[PDB]
Design a binder for these strands. Structure first.
Lengths: 63, 226, 97, 127, 25
RNA sequence: GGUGAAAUUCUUGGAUUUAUUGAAGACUAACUACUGCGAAAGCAUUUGCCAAGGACGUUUUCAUUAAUCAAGAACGAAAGUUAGGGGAUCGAAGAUGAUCAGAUACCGUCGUAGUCUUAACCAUAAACUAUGCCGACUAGGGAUCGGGUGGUGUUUUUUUAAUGACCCACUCGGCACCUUACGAGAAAUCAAAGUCUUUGGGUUCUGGGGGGAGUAUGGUCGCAAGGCUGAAACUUAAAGGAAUUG
RNA sequence: AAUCCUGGAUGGAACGAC
RNA sequence: UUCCUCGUGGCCCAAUGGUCACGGCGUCUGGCUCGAACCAGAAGAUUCCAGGUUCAAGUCCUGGCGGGGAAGCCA
RNA sequence: UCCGAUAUAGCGUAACGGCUAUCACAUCACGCUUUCACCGUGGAGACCGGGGUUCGACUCCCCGUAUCGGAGCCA
C-alpha cells in the first residue's frame, strides 16, 4: 500500500459546480521533474505537500 | 460489467504460450535489413503441420525499419509468407501503403488533388493495381491564393502518368520494381514529364496492391534469400 | 423578416449541394450551411509526450498527428460552445478571430 | 535485442479495447477491455479503466518475453464518430510508464470513400 | 393547428365523403 | 454492447476483438470553396463513345427574321403507384426495452414497405433570391471563373526556343461581394426593391380586410393517392408587417 | 555558452391558470 | 331446470387450516410549491348469509341469496 | 420401472471435506441529490427430509418426497 508525495508549484483555479474544489499542478518530490495536474478538496497554497494514493492519473484540465 | 453476465454458456485451465514457439522472419534482398522480428505459432502437431497455418501470414512493417533511414518513414509494406525452413521463415513482397497521417497532411484545400490508377501486369506474370497521387503547388511570384487546374490539364496528367507506369512496370518483374519504388525515381520521372504542363508538388505515388499471383516457383523466391 | 443575406449559407448559383451528416446528431444538413472545422491535433497530448520520448526507441521519431474535418449542425454547434451568437451588427464580420 | 508486438488500441465511447499481438496479427496476447476492471457499464470508457487494462497486459507481455510494441490506434470509424475515445491516450501513457518500449505509432481509423448511410434520420438524434 | 395537419385532416375527411357518396352513386 | 443512467439483445455452442480471403448492393468522403455547368429541378470517381451548349475571338454570312405571353406542349426533388430485377446499410408502419403521473413520442435494439435499377404514371414543394422576362441609364473598390489582347516581365524546358504555369495592365460575359446613399422604402433593407405625385420604355400573371376555405358542388386529368379550375350562406373589427422600450 | 516543439468537449425529469 | 364457478376495505385483485387478512388505486393529515405530480405518514375489514368439523377456519364441508358461463339434442 | 439432472436467504443463483455458505433483486439504516429518480457502504437474513461414511459433509453413499426431459410397459 504505497503512496506518492508531491509538492505544489502552481495553483490554477477553482472547479466544480459548487466551487468547493481546486485544480493544481504539482511536482513530485522523488522522481522529480514530473508535473501532474490534480483536483483538491480543501484549502491549499503553493509549496504545500499532498499524498497521491495513486500518482498515475489526472483530471480534465479546464483551460 | 464484472458480475453483469447472466450466463456464460448457452446450454449450461491450460496455458497456451507454453504450447507455442517463436520464428524469425526474413525479408528479401531488396532491403538493407532482413531480420524483421518474430512470430508465434503452436507446435507442429501431427494433424496441423503449423507451417500451413503460418504460410499465408501477412505482416505489415515500416520501410524505415527495413532501410535505416527515416526518409522512408510512412511507406508501410505488407509482406506475405511463402516458405519455411527451420525457424527463419522467408517472405516476399505483397504491397505498399502510405500512412494516413502523411496522406491527410499532404491533403490541403485551396489546391487541386489528382489521382490515377492502373491495373497493369508484369513480365513475371504478376498483376498489380498501382495508385498514384499528385497535388498542385503555388508557384513563387504567385499572389492568387488557390492554384487550381482546368480539368483538361488533369486528364493529360493522368494519361501521362498511366502510360509512364505501364512502361516502367513492363520490363520490371517484381523486385526490379521494388528497387524502382524505394528510391522514388518514378516521382522524378513524373515531375520531369509533367513540369511542362503544371507544377505538381507532392508526387509520392500511393499504396500498391497485388491482385493475382503466378505460380509459386521456389527458385525465384530463394534467389533473394542467400 | 430576413435575418441574413446568404440566408444561412454560401449557396449562390446552385440550387442543390448534396448534403452531409452531423457527427454528433447525425442530422442531414447541406455542406454549405454546415460549419466545417478541422481538428488537427497531436495524437496523444502535450503532457505524456515526455514519457513517450523517454520510453521510445527510434528517437526523435515524429510525434505525428490526427486530421479530420468535422461538420456540426447549427444546433449541436451552439450547444458545444462554438459560434455561439452575435449582435445584429457583428453578425456581418466574416473573418475569424 | 528487442522483440516487438502490436497493440491495436480501439478506444470508442462506451468502451476501450487493448489486445496485443505478434507482428503477423494472427497470434494474440492479453486481450482486455476497460469493462473487465470495473462494474458500472459507464466507466467502461474511462481513462482509469484503460490504464488498469494497460498495466495488466504490460505484465502479461513482460512475463511472456515481449519488450517493445507498436501502436495502432483506432476509433469506431465507418459511419460513426471517426474520432478516438477518451480512454485511448491514458492507456497509451500507462503501458509506456509500465516499462515497455514503443515504436511507430499510427492511426488506422477506418475512413470510407463516402459510405452507405449514417443512422438517426435526417432530423437527427433529437435529445 | 399546424396547417400541414389541417390539410391532412381535410384530405382524410374528403376521402370519407367521397366513399359515403359513392355508396349511393 | 448501447445510454444521461439502464435495460431489451448477443455471449465456453467462443461473443466483442485481431488477421486473411470471398460475395452482394448502394455511395463517390478528404480535395469541396461567399468556385463551375444547367431552363429549372438538379449535377462530383476513371476511361471511352454520342450528340448538344454558353462565353470569347471574328474586317464571315442573312437581313429585321425580334421581346413577352392567354389557349396549347416538353422537363419536373422527395414521397407515392403499377410490373419485373436486386434487396448491403438506413428505415414511415409495426414489435419491443426504458423514461414518464401517463408516452403506441422524443432515447435504445430489431425490423417489413421504401431507399437502387429498367418500362409506364403522378405533376406538387419554403420548387425561395419568397424579388417575372426583355432593354437603356445612374457611385465607387477589390478579388475571382472562362475566353481574349498586350507587356524586352518571372520561371520551366533544349542557358535559349514555341508552348505551359505565374506577375503587371486592359477588356467581354458570369457566380457573387465590401463601402456609401444622390435616390428609394413603413422599416428592416436595396446598385437594384433606383431612374414613380417631376406619376407613362414594352409585355405576361396575380391580389382587394380576416375567417369559413383552397371547403362544397359541377367539370376535366389521373390505376389510385390526388392535382388544376373553384363559390356562397354565415361570422367578425380587427387579423397582419417592420421596427422601439420593457 | 548550452537549448527540438506544441492546447481539448458530452449529458436525465421539470403540466397548468384560477 | 341441470351442471360448473365466483362472492373479500369506497373499486380491482391476491391468500399454505396457523396472527381480527397482502398489495395497488382511492380518501385524509403534513411537507415542497397556488393546484396537479412528488415525498413522508395514518385511517378504513364482522372476507355474501346461516350451520357444523377442528385447539384454531377468510380457506375444510352442507344449506340459502346473488352474479357469470355451458348444456338444453333425434324427429 | 429405468437413465440423468434439480431442490439453497422473501425471489433467483454460485459453491472444492481445512467455514452455520457468495452473489443481484427484496428490506434496515447510512450516504449523495433542490427534489425525483439514478448511484454507493454497512447490516439481519437460506443448503428438500431422513439414516450412513469420514481429524471434518451443502457437497460423498443409501433411502424417501417433489419437478423436469427421454426411453419403456403381458397381471
Amino acid at each position: 500500500t504505497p503512496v506518492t508525495l508531491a509538492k505544489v508549484i502552481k495553483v490554477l483555479g477553482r472547479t466544480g459546480s459548487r466551487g468547493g474544489v481546486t485544480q493544481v499542478r504539482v511536482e513530485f518530490l522523488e522522481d522529480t521533474s514530473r508535473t501532474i495536474v490534480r483536483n483538491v478538496k480543501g484549502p491549499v497554497r503553493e509549496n504545500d505537500i499532498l499524498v497521491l494514493m495513486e500518482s498515475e492519473r489526472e483530471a480534465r484540465r479546464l483551460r | 460489467a464484472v458480475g453483469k453476465n447472466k450466463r456464460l454458456s448457452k446450454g449450461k485451465v491450460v496455458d497456451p504460450f507454453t504450447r507455442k514457439e517463436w520464428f524469425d522472419i526474413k525479408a528479401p534482398s531488396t532491403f538493407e535489413n532482413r531480420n524483421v522480428g518474430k512470430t508465434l505459432v503452436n507446435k507442429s502437431t501431427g494433424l496441423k503441420s503449423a507451417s500451413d497455418a503460418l504460410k499465408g501470414r501477412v505482416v505489415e512493417v515500416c520501410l524505415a525499419d527495413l532501410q535505416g533511414s527515416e526518409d522512408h518513414s510512412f511507406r508501410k509494406i505488407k509482406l506475405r509468407v511463402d516458405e519455411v525452413q527451420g525457424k527463419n521463415l522467408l517472405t516476399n513482397f505483397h504491397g505498399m501503403d502510405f500512412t494516413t497521417d502523411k496522406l491527410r497532411s499532404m491533403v490541403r484545400k485551396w489546391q487541386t488533388l489528382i489521382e490515377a490508377n492502373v491495373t497493369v501486369k508484369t513480365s513475371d506474370d504478376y498483376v498489380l493495381r498501382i495508385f498514384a497521387i499528385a497535388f498542385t503547388r503555388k508557384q513563387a511570384n504567385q499572389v492568387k491564393r488557390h492554384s487550381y487546374a482546368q480539368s483538361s490539364h488533369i486528364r493529360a496528367i493522368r494519361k501521362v502518368i498511366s502510360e509512364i507506369l505501364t512502361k516502367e512496370v513492363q520490363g520490371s518483374t517484381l523486385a526490379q520494381l521494388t528497387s524502382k519504388l524505394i528510391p522514388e525515381v518514378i516521382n522524378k520521372e513524373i515531375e520531369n514529364a509533367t513540369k511542362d504542363i503544371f507544377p505538381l508538388q507532392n508526387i509520392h505515388v500511393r499504396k500498391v496492391k497485388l491482385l493475382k499471383q503466378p505460380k509459386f516457383d521456389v527458385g525465384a523466391l530463394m534467389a533473394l534469400h542467400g | 423578416p430576413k435575418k441574413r443575406a446568404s440566408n444561412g449559407r454560401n449557396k449562390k448559383g446552385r440550387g442543390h449541394v448534396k448534403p452531409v451528416r452531423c457527427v454528433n446528431c447525425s442530422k442531414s444538413i447541406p455542406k454549405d450551411k454546415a460549419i466545417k472545422r478541422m481538428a488537427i491535433r497531436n495524437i496523444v497530448e502535450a503532457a505524456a509526450v515526455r514519457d513517450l520520448s523517454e520510453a521510445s526507441v527510434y528517437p526523435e521519431y515524429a510525434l505525428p498527428k490526427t486530421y479530420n474535418k468535422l461538420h456540426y449542425c447549427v444546433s449541436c454547434a451552439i450547444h458545444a460552445r462554438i459560434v455561439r451568437v452575435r449582435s445584429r451588427e457583428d453578425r456581418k464580420n466574416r473573418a475569424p478571430p | 535485442s528487442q522483440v516487438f508486438g502490436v497493440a491495436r488500441i480501439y478506444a470508442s465511447f462506451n468502451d476501450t479495447f487493448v489486445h496485443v499481438t505478434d507482428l503477423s496479427g494472427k497470434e494474440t496476447i492479453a486481450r482486455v477491455t476497460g469493462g473487465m476492471k470495473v462494474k458500472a457499464d459507464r466507466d467502461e470508457s474511462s481513462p482509469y479503466a484503460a490504464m488498469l487494462a494497460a498495466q495488466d497486459v504490460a505484465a502479461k507481455c513482460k512475463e511472456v518475453g515481449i519488450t517493445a510494441v507498436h501502436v495502432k490506434i483506432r476509433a469506431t470509424g465507418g459511419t460513426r464518430t471517426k474520432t478516438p475515445g477518451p480512454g485511448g491516450q491514458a492507456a497509451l501513457r500507462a503501458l509506456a510508464r509500465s516499462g515497455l518500449r514503443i515504436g511507430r505509432i499510427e492511426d488506422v481509423t477506418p475512413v470510407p470513400s463516402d459510405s452507405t448511410r449514417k443512422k438517426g434520420g435526417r432530423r437527427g438524434r433529437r435529445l | 393547428m399546424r396547417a400541414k395537419w389541417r390539410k391532412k385532416r381535410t384530405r382524410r375527411l374528403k376521402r370519407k365523403r367521397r366513399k359515403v357518396r359513392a355508396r349511393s352513386k
